[PDB]
Amino acid sequence: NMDWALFLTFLAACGAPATTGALLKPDEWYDNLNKPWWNPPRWVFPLAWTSLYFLMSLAAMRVAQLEGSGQALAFYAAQLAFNTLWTPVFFGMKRMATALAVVMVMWLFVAATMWAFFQLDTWAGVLFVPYLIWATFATGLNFEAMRLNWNRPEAR
Amino acid sequence: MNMDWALFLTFLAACGAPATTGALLKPDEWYDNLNKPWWNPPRWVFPLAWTSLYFLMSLAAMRVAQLEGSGQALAFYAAQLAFNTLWTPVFFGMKRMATALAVVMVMWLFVAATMWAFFQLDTWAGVLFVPYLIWATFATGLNFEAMRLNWNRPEAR
Numbered sequence A: 001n002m003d004w005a006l007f008l009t010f011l012a013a014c015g016a017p018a019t020t021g022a023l024l025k026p027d028e029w030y031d032n033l034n035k036p037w038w039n040p041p042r043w044v045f046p047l048a049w050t051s052l053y054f055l056m057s058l059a060a061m062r063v064a065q066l067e068g069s070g071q072a073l074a075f076y077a078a079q080l081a082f083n084t085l086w087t088p089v090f091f092g093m094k095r096m097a098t099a100l101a102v103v104m105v106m107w108l109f110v111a112a113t114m115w116a117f118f119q120l121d122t123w124a125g126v127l128f129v130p131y132l133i134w135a136t137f138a139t140g141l142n143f144e145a146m147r148l149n150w151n152r153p154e155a156r
Numbered sequence B: 001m002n003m004d005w006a007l008f009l010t011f012l013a014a015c016g017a018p019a020t021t022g023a024l025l026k027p028d029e030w031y032d033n034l035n036k037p038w039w040n041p042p043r044w045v046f047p048l049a050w051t052s053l054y055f056l057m058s059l060a061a062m063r064v065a066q067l068e069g070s071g072q073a074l075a076f077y078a079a080q081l082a083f084n085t086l087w088t089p090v091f092f093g094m095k096r097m098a099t100a101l102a103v104v105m106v107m108w109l110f111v112a113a114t115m116w117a118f119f120q121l122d123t124w125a126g127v128l129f130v131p132y133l134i135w136a137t138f139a140t141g142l143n144f145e146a147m148r149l150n151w152n153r154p155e156a157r
């Protein structure tokens, strides 16, 4: 059920958030921050995001072939935009509290996309489960970055 | 084909992400120093124009999302919105004028693709995107002239 035009369009759309990561690698401002005890090493993040961009694009390709896809793809557009927004807010401007709001809104749209995907295609919904899990970890990391660095002005 | 509020509000909420990039822009002395073309509008014009476009593009997507075969058009729509969200941090936040030109040109291509695919399904949704493509052409020209008219420092390799 492989529609390559659809899949490559969704993958190309992931070039926008992928670009935020390439142009805003965490520096020692990030390394100096107090990390939660469960903080993963740096190499985990490019692995996780590359896999998720491929998985969410495959899921979107499947759903976009189905009747009644409209609302699910609207949710998909929404989560992707806030996904693109997060890195410049946290790593570019160091607005940690605003970034927490961003990742929480993204989380809601990721959950809505996954739910809407399950309504139309079980596999597309399953492909989004690791994304919702990873988005949960991202929200916790954003929260812990603020709670463990509250004496920094950029955390408040 | 109706005014579908779940669809429309979802697409409008999605434009909250690029709207946020604009909202977090403090007045910049580097931007005020830049040589601008005579046809550069004052700064207050941009949030007004983008707000109108967010409503226009969201209404267009709402109409298309109700139609069979919308998939490719909606995929184009997701792409244009994502690169739209990318542009402001690249130009104003990181001050990477050349990379921002590439971003806005990619956005332009996906805006053109969305409008074309929208026209294939619904003329009015395509019409609603025409002022967006016009604005995107104007935005690309401003990025091009800003780079052409000023000193540019090297970007980090």
Ligand code: HEM
Pocket (backbone or CB within 6 Å): A017, A018, A020, A021, A022, A025, A026, A041, A042, A043, A045, A046, A049, A082, A083, A084, A086, A087, A103, A106, A137, A138, A139, A141, A142, A145
């Ligand atoms: C919506 C949330 C997030 C998005 C969209 C995102 C995006 C990305 C992407 C795409 C990359 C890969 C860059 C590349 O492959 O060139 C990356 C790397 C990274 N990000 Fe995130 N990220 C998010 C959340 C977070 C959070 C919460 C943290 C930490 C508090 C974080 C810290 C990092 C780190 C440490 C790297 C590794 C950089 C390296 O290569 O050394 N990210 N991010």
Ligand SMILES: CCCCCCCC/C=C/CCCCCCCC(=O)OC[C@H](O)CO
Pocket (backbone or CB within 6 Å): A005, A006, A008, A009, A012, A015, A016, A018, A019, A022, B072, B106
């Ligand atoms: C990681 C940093 C690099 C980021 C990379 C930036 C994004 C690349 C954009 C390429 C142009 C778009 C090409 C993608 C292909 C579009 C799919 C397509 O053309 O669909 C055909 C359809 O039939 C039409 O009606």
Ligand SMILES: CCCCCCCC/C=C\CCCCCCCC(=O)OC[C@H](O)CO
Pocket (backbone or CB within 6 Å): B001, B002, B003, B004, B049, B052, B053, B056, B059, B063, B131, B135
């Ligand atoms: C570059 C500057 C930006 C350009 C901005 C200039 C125009 C904006 C003003 C008014 C638009 C009003 C048009 C509203 C069209 C609504 C269409 C609609 O709601 O129709 C859906 C429903 O299904 C029906 O059947």
Ligand SMILES: CCCCCCCC/C=C\CCCCCCCC(=O)OC[C@H](O)CO
Pocket (backbone or CB within 6 Å): B006, B007, B009, B010, B012, B013, B014, B015, B016, B019, B047, B050, B051, B054
């Ligand atoms: C199925 C149910 C789906 C529910 C969907 C979620 C509900 C979204 C509610 C309201 C969105 C309000 C509009 C979001 C903000 C619009 C973006 C904008 O226009 O920015 C403001 C302006 O530009 C500043 O200058």
Ligand SMILES: CCCCCCCC/C=C\CCCCCCCC(=O)OC[C@H](O)CO
Pocket (backbone or CB within 6 Å): A098, A101, A102, A105, A108, A109, A112, B012, B013, B014, B016, B017, B020, B023, B024
């Ligand atoms: C089913 C899930 C639906 C629930 C999702 C609907 C959320 C509201 C959407 C857009 C509002 C725009 C703000 C969204 C968050 C942007 C980050 C922020 O809050 O910052 C705004 C401020 O303007 C920075 O200066």
